[PDB]
């Protein structure tokens, strides 16, 4: 099924021609557009008062990365390198070795935030919910160097944001 968008022929009756002439000479449709703009002037604007008001977000939102840990304080990451393998931008660099207690842990976990595309593939590849994408998005920087995160920065981000991260994961994990 199809429709014609512009296939109407104007009436030739004196009345139709006079109406078209009145439109041409008196600018009726221009006045109609002016009235539309006038009506729009008198309705409440859609502006919010940033930063005192914020934009609504979802528990699924992808923001700044963080490394998490178990309630005992032991870190969840066991250096499987699945996030490094899946990263489309090759933004994760991992080095691991046995710990002093024989535990399988990382000695290097770097994320280059200027290569990252914030796709969230790493957190869905993780088998132990170690690397996550947090809710924070206000982390602009004055230099390029501070956007190259090492393991200490990501652990500090986890310790900073764990409350919100845990609440969001509780809200959304039944869809995963």
């Amino acid at each position: 099924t199809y429709k014609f968008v512009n296939m109407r022929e104007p009436s030739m009756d004196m009345k139709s021609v006079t109406d078209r002439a009145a439109q041409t000479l008196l600018w009726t449709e221009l006045v109609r557009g002016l009235g539309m703009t006038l009506s729009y002037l008198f309705r409440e604007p859609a502006t919010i008062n940033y930063p005192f008001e914020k934009g609504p977000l979802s528990p699924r939102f992808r923001g700044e990365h963080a490394l998490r840990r178990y309630p005992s304080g032991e870190e969840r990451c066991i250096a499987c390198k699945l996030c490094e393998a899946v990263c489309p931008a090759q933004a994760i660099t991992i080095e691991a070795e046995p710990r002093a207690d024989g535990s399988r842990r990382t000695t290097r976990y770097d994320i280059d935030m200027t290569k990252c595309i914030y796709c969230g593939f790493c957190q869905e590849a993780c088998p132990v919910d170690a690397i996550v994408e947090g809710p924070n998005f206000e982390f602009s920087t004055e230099t390029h160097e501070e956007l190259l995160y090492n393991k200490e920065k990501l652990l500090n981000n986890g310790d900073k944001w764990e409350a919100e991260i845990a609440a969001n994961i509780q809200a959304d994990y039944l869809y995963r």
């Binding site: 393998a85 090759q90 660099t93 280059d112």
Partner: protein, 208 residues
Amino acid sequence: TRPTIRPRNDVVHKQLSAFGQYVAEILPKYVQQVQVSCFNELEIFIHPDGVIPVLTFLRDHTNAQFKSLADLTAVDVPTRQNRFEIVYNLLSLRFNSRIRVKTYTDELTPIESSVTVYKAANWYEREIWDMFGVFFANHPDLRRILTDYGFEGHPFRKDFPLSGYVELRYDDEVKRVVAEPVELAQEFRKFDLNSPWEAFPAYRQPPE
């Protein structure tokens, strides 16, 4: 074939096989092979000399009328004596059908330009020349279209490295943008992902 398997269409398969045999019968001077894939796509493998005739036929014959050129591109296969294969995708609106025409060339053999058959080919051919180094004869204006001015090489070739050979920066001594040999602070990490234990027995090659 339960709900996870793609359903198959035998009527379209038969129709495309019949049209392939029809085309091969009509143009035996240029057609070397005809194929219909399991997802009902018909491709015709031709000799390079028949690019202009075959295409013209498929555009102008009353039983084909493939009036639309959907895409024209090239594929680089270094292991073949003729390195590059040229792929034409054609759409027929009268018969609601699609067809594919393949031919081949190497780094030094020109291919006839098809701008006289399809006006759309022009830029496509430029792109091919830009990315693979295939020259098209009788092209109205063949030149680079995607790469930077004065760029050396053809980046879509398999032996071309991913990051190229030069990188750009701003120099304050000469007060301009300059090109230098590429140096990466982090080398791209090459992954060996292919597993042993072949996946598909239906595509096994003879052990020669």
